[PDB]
Design a protein around this nucleic acid. Structure first.
Ligand SMILES: Nc1ncnc2c1ncn2[C@@H]1O[C@H](COP(=O)(O)OP(=O)(O)OP(=O)(O)O)[C@@H](O)[C@H]1O
Ligand SMILES: Nc1ncnc2c1ncn2[C@@H]1O[C@H](COP(=O)(O)OP(=O)(O)OP(=O)(O)O)[C@@H](O)[C@H]1O
Ligand SMILES: [K+]
Ligand SMILES: [K+]
Ligand SMILES: [K+]
Ligand SMILES: [K+]
Ligand SMILES: [Mg+2]
Ligand SMILES: [Mg+2]
Ligand SMILES: [Mg+2]
Ligand SMILES: [Mg+2]
Ligand SMILES: [Mg+2]
Ligand SMILES: [Mg+2]
Ligand SMILES: [Mg+2]
Ligand SMILES: [Mg+2]
Ligand SMILES: [Mg+2]
Ligand SMILES: [Mg+2]
Ligand SMILES: [Mg+2]
Ligand SMILES: [Mg+2]
Ligand SMILES: [Mg+2]
Ligand SMILES: [Mg+2]
Ligand SMILES: [Mg+2]
Ligand SMILES: [Mg+2]
Ligand SMILES: [Mg+2]
Ligand SMILES: [Mg+2]
Ligand SMILES: [Mg+2]
Ligand SMILES: [Mg+2]
Ligand SMILES: [Mg+2]
Ligand SMILES: [Mg+2]
Ligand SMILES: [Mg+2]
Ligand SMILES: [Mg+2]
Ligand SMILES: [Mg+2]
Ligand SMILES: [Mg+2]
Ligand SMILES: [Mg+2]
Lengths: 48, 495
RNA sequence: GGAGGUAUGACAA
RNA sequence: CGCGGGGUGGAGCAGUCAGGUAGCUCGUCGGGCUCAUAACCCGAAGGUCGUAGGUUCAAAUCCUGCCCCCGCAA
RNA sequence: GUGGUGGCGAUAGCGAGAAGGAUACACCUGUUCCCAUGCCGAACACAGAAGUUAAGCUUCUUAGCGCCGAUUGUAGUGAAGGGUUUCCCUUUGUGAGAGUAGGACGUCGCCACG
RNA sequence: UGAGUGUUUGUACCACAUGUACAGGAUAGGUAGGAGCCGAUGAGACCGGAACGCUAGUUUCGGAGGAGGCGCUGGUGGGAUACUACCCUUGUGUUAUGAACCCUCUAACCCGCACCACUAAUCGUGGUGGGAGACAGUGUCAGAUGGGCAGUUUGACUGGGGCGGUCGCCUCCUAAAAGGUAACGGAGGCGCCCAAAGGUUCCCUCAGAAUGGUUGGAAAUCAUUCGAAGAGUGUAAAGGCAGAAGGGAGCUUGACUGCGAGACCUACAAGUCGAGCAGGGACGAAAGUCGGGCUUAGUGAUCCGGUGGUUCCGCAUGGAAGG
RNA sequence: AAGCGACUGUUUAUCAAAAACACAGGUCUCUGCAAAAUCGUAAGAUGAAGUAUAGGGGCUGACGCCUGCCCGGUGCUGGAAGGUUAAGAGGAUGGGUUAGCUUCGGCGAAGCUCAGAAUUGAAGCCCCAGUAAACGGCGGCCGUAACUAUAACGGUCCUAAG
RNA sequence: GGUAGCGGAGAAAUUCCAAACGAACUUGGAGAUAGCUGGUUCUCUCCGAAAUAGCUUUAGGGCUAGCCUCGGAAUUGAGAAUGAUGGAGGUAGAGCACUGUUUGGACUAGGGGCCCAUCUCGGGUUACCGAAUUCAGAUAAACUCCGAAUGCCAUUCAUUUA
RNA sequence: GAAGAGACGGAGCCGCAGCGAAAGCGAGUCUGAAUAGGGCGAAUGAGUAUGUAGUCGUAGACCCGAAACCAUGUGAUCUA
RNA sequence: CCUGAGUACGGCGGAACACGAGAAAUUCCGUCGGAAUCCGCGGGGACCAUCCCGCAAGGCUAAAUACUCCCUAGUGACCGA
RNA sequence: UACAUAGCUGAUUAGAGGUAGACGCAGAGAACUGAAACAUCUUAGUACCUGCAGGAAGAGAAAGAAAAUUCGAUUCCCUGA
């Protein structure tokens, strides 16, 4: 239910982040604005 | 075609709809693909289309067609939406529909004016027009009658190359299908044979499972008893190391080490026996995974003095005075079931609309309910349901507990109640509609094809319940066997 | 017309 | 004080594993049949499942305690 | 003298009582605008200056509450010993808490105005 | 371990046929040509049978017949017919092939069957009969069974040993006012949760008691006063917090990347804190805070595999395999 | 007079003479003759220079009266439809390479090579029946009588059977 | 004369197979292995321990650290002790200011009956049981408004030693 | 060449340059976007051949000591 | 025209190569199947292409190397019942 | 069983067997042990047994080693390590 999760830069398709979430409370595919060091900017990181 | 190590779960899911699936079929097998509601048949067809994010691996090198095709602009004409989905030959489609039973005038009507019968038939025409692609056929025989099913089975027997379909229709798959995938509970299975063979072999599996479980339970209880008794014996021997203070001389005991050694050997017997019991429990835990645990149902039938609940007199009904069936007179009394039947587009749902006053056509003849009569209602067009269930049951004045109870009795796992009706499978939406009906305190029940998108277990549940209670009901079905099991008052409307 | 064979009911009065 | 197995209408029992809203048989009560009784037939009553709480949309069931019964020990 | 703003373990505080508004602080009149109230212009915010300082706020009294707090003496205890050794005692040194005597209704500054 | 027959048939050629949506002269296979084309080398068109079949019919077989014909053009339909071929699905056949399977054969193999000879031999080798027979047996490979047999395993702590209990981690006491400190000493918890229960900005302060008030009670909710924490702090206990870490509302995602002087603890492996620098940001007017939560548990080596990326390597070279 | 074993016999050379072993008898089971079983790599041999009234194996153990119920489980025997079931045959396709094309990208014939699908494929397992002098097994609770006790009797649950 | 040890024979006891047979005897691998016991030989001098932590299929074994010895080296002489000074820390003691336990008394919500009144409605009393408040008195390893002596850390502080 | 010393024999060994997984760079290198910081190293410098002693490893490795295991063979003159 | 055929090779099962199937080249044994031959064949550590090197499936071949029951001549910081 | 072959007989030809408790090719092939247990693995292709032998044997004139366009049959010592 509570699962460990690799996020991913939608552009680079690079994972770049590890995190946690419920599936009940956070069923929709999580997203954030996180730093991609390969681009050295901030970018929409989407769960995968 | 190959599935390698596939795992998958929708974003909503707590659990894995698939966990390391490993199978292999081809374009040549006439394959069925069966399971209960909510197991992943349609999901799996999508994953074959690579329409979702499959973890693991899938191999194919072939073009697909998914029936039902996804359609927009339900307002526009049928010809328009069909051209928008896939181009084709108008005359070819006419040929297919006339080998089926519907006039091409339906093409130049709006797509929603049709019944589900003609919707299904026309999209099957679109299927049959295509030649090279690989058919994926999700529940074709639902919203369809004997003639359509017969001609479709004829086509699929004549079919040279392979296909895949999801049916829930036992005889229909038995006529045509060779290989079977079966999304059982907790695993996945592949056989060569028809659904009858699958029934037999799964019964054998369940028998074996239950018998072995009973063996293990019996033996483990035996071994636990014996372990406890050996243990008490050891303790009684340890008591011999010591005497009694009340009586003189009982002590001064010699070779307590040997006493304790022998007691230890007896405890070691007890422990060997306990370890055996634990191994047997480990064997037990592998069992009872592919079962269903069928359950009954209930029904909030609430009769009154009205021995006449509905009357119809000389009712001729249609649109634009193209009167749709010859005039009829009939009646629905208490504790009486009435099976209204006919072809597709014969006007059954139209009759229901005339009863409930929302008929946008032409009427001549009489149809009279009682004074303050309560209806429960299961329609052919339940798309309108939307949102969570704790809100559905507020829009529709219900008890949330009885609602979810009847759902779980129909066979929806309680992991699904957190989902939305937009997300649920068509069978699960259908179960929502049926559970609404069963939870509504009512005096007449009006069932417009409850049996389409359900499981064989659900067919059996409904038959057993309706034959047990025998309430007053109007019924519309194309599963003639079901209406034979229940009703004798059968009525065939026609033009 | 007739012959042989072919479930429970107290005791006494 | 501990270890096992029990507490479900008056009796005996399932259902407990797998939550889906209390049932099988006998018995009791009432009315019928009978000259009458038994049997038989038609009806009803009798339990939120030992108890105080949690979890849950929902608990006899899952969890936590508390109180009784049968074995051992004690 | 009032207002603002800081430091010192409230010895500063809490309560009660008296007086004052010169400027000041305040209440106070409203919602016109910036802005705001899971409702309210009560609070926030804005604008004003009819009225009263009643209250708040200042200054004074009060040792009632709370705070601080000795000296003496004791318990405890480091070291050195003794005894009749789960404890007790002796020499030396340190030394509470409690209970008080008593203090205490503020001290130190900076700035603006009168 | 070879000679056949037959069947189920797979494939491939080659000849055969059969193609009915709806409307429509009507049983319209697609395609182009198509208005010409056939007949005593037996027309028109009748009779009986056969195949298929949607039961309307098509075709053929045989009999009669002895001269004519079919269509265009036009209507419906997407498409109109006759006839030519390119032909295509479907199912009949010939032939060649490939497998599986049953029977038949004998010539391989076999006979602890007889007779003859070597030979005085119940061995054996040959020969002649007979029997079985391409099976068995043997070899290789594979599956099931296999204590018949073999090699091995079968914790520790412990007021002997054994059972019970415990083994990793967190909190308190024990623990003797630094830290540390044992016992099968006393008490409890953990093997997670939160997408806001984080961050920032702004704002707020609780529990209970008294009084009064409708259902409304002992007690819900409202109002005033009392109220220094007697509440709450996701979850145990301890410590701490009302300058909030507690509570509420906005904006977000710093629950960032590379790091990291220096310290604490430490046998080692590990663990803990960390200012500050750089990049790129959040909030806020700005100061400035933000490298998760209130602090301390929510976890486990290496080997081995899996997934993604990589400017790394690539057995002479280029790749690839594989690292 | 009692127990055990029917008996005569055999037995732990050197602590046990026995109620232990055997025994005749009984029963079950296997085996059609190149028997079955066994020794042995195999030849070969015993069995037998025998042939189901013979031989081997298990159990019981003279004689007499008997030998009850259970085939649900574990085995065995037989059966057979269906599913599943290895190697092997089968070879579809997919990667790697590259003649050549390219538009740089990239694609890619033949050959070779690395993995190899569908299909086919026995016994066996899941299944049906039988079998207990085969392995083994053979219950609880509640009431119920005209003194009291007790229960011929009844109810109920389970069992494969009690 | 025959059966020979991964075996034979066994009227079956773990029995016999050349005076010890749960697998003979002998030779070789072989100086098997032994975290186990026993032993390990002349002298003097300098210095001189530990029996503790952690981890360990580990617990009478081992590894690292700790404690010892020897050699080198450098460093604002750090080390040890005593004094002065300043700090952390909540122990013995004491106390009830919180958390629990607890005695007696005043009062009492509330809970008991008895009676009158009963629609069971309102009382009045056993100096009935008694929340809660308060007075006085106590108590604590897992209570602290308080709080030492000692011990600990540190001082380009002092003295004495090394 | 006395069973010698000694001569010849420079193949090879160590050290003088390290850093990084490696490509590769080089008193620098790696990490990193990075002249940042940090790690490892250099400017600080000394090693090598032989002997000798202490210690360790591989060989029985300090001496004795098992029951036991395996592979040949010998034994039925005892006893079954 | 010839230049070593049931051979090389491949599959299955096993071994030896330092190399324990591992990416496993190379060599050998059993079994079954099963090539071409000068524009040919094998290897260069899976494998393909290029290049290079070599030409199996037939045989022999001294020397340097190991050891001493023995014979002769001897030697020892080897023993001395 | 006719041709003959087998068989029998006679002349010929060369083998047997043990050494040297040592060396080396081949066949077959352990365990104790070590891994602090143990099964892969190790001990170890060792010990043992057997066959073939010769003074030596075995290997041996590239279907090679390399990457140099180069070395030129095996064996043995050092080194690589
Ligand atoms: N879009 C979705 N999001 C989340 N859950 C989904 C979604 N679609 C399906 N599911 C869930 O996944 C499960 C399988 O759904 P699916 O549509 O595959 O069923 P199915 O096999 O087709 O059954 P049915 O007989 O109902 O058609 C169900 O539990 C369903 O609720
Ligand atoms: N709005 C409309 N206008 C014209 N015709 C309509 C309309 N709605 C329905 N029809 C026609 O009426 C006929 C029957 O419609 P109806 O919905 O009653 O069918 P039904 O009996 O439910 O059929 P089915 O068995 O297919 O479900 C069909 O021919 C349909 O095309
Ligand atoms: K049975
Ligand atoms: K190999
Ligand atoms: K052992
Ligand atoms: K030679
Ligand atoms: Mg579906
Ligand atoms: Mg309908
Ligand atoms: Mg009655
Ligand atoms: Mg004092
Ligand atoms: Mg014989
Ligand atoms: Mg064994
Ligand atoms: Mg061993
Ligand atoms: Mg132990
Ligand atoms: Mg003990
Ligand atoms: Mg301490
Ligand atoms: Mg290369
Ligand atoms: Mg190469
Ligand atoms: Mg007796
Ligand atoms: Mg006797
Ligand atoms: Mg006798
Ligand atoms: Mg004796
Ligand atoms: Mg007996
Ligand atoms: Mg014995
Ligand atoms: Mg050895
Ligand atoms: Mg104390
Ligand atoms: Mg052994
Ligand atoms: Mg003899
Ligand atoms: Mg090769
Ligand atoms: Mg081979
Ligand atoms: Mg001598
Ligand atoms: Mg002498
Ligand atoms: Mg070992």
């Amino acid at each position: 239910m509570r699962v460990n999760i690799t996020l991913e830069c939608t552009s680079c398709k690079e994972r770049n982040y590890l995190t946690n979430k419920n599936k009940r409370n956070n069923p929709d595919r999580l997203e954030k604005q996180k730093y991609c060091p390969r681009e050295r900017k901030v970018t929409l990181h989407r769960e995968t | 075609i190959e599935l390698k190590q596939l795992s998958f779960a929708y974003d909503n899911q707590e659990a894995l709809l698939f966990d390391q699936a490993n199978i292999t079929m081809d374009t040549n097998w006439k394959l069925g693909l069966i399971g209960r509601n909510g197991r992943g048949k349609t999901t799996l067809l999508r994953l074959l289309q690579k329409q979702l994010d499959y973890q693991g691996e899938i191999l194919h090198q072939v073009d697909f067609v998914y029936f039902p095709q996804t359609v927009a602009e339900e307002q526009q004409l049928t010809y328009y939406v069909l051209q928008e989905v896939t181009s084709f030959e108008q005359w070819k489609l006419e040929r297919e529909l006339t080998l089926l039973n519907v006039d091409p005038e339906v093409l130049w009507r709006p797509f929603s004016s049709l019944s589900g019968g003609e919707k299904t038939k026309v999209l099957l025409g679109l299927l049959f027009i295509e030649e090279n692609a690989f058919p994926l056929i999700d529940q074709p025989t639902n919203h369809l009658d004997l003639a359509g099913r017969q001609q479709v089975a004829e086509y699929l027997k004549k079919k040279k190359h392979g296909f895949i379909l999801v049916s829930h229709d036992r005889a229909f798959v038995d006529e045509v299908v060779d290989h079977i995938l079966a999304i059982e509970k907790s695993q996945l299975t592949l056989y060569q044979g028809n659904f009858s063979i699958y029934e037999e072999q799964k019964k054998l599996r369940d028998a074996f499972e239950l018998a072995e479980n009973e063996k293990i339970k019996k033996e483990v209880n035996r071994l636990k008893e014996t372990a406890r008794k050996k243990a008490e014996w050891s303790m009684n021997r340890e008591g011999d190391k010591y005497g009694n203070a009340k009586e003189k001389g009982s002590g001064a005991i010699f070779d307590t080490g040997a006493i304790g050694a022998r007691a230890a050997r007896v405890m070691k017997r007890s422990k060997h026996i306990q370890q055996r019991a634990e191994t047997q429990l480990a064997e037990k835990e592998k069992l009872l995974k592919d079962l269903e645990y069928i359950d009954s149902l209930s029904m909030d039938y609430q009769p009154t003095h009205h021995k006449t609940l509905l009357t119809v007199e000389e009712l001729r009904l249609g649109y634009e005075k193209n009167w749709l069936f010859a005039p009829i007179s009939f009646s629905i009394n208490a504790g009486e079931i009435v099976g209204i039947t006919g072809k597709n587009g014969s006007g059954k749902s139209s009759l229901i609309q005339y009863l409930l006053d929302n008929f946008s056509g032409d009427s001549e003849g009489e149809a009279t309910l009682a004074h303050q009569l309560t209806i429960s209602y299961v329609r052919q067009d339940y798309e309108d349901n939307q949102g969570t269930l704790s809100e559905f049951a507020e829009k529709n004045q219900l008890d949330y507990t009885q609602f979810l109870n009847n759902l779980r009795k129909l066979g929806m796992e309680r992991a699904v109640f957190t989902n939305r009706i937009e997300q649920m499978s068509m069978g699960q939406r259908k179960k929502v509609e049926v559970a609404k009906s069963l939870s509504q305190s009512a005096e007449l029940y009006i069932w417009d094809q409850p049996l389409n998108y359900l499981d064989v277990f659900n067919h059996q549940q409904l038959e057993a319940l309706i034959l047990s209670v025998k309430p007053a009901m109007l019924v519309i079905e194309h599963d003639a066997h079901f209406m034979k099991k229940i009703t004798d008052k059968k009525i065939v409307l026609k033009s």
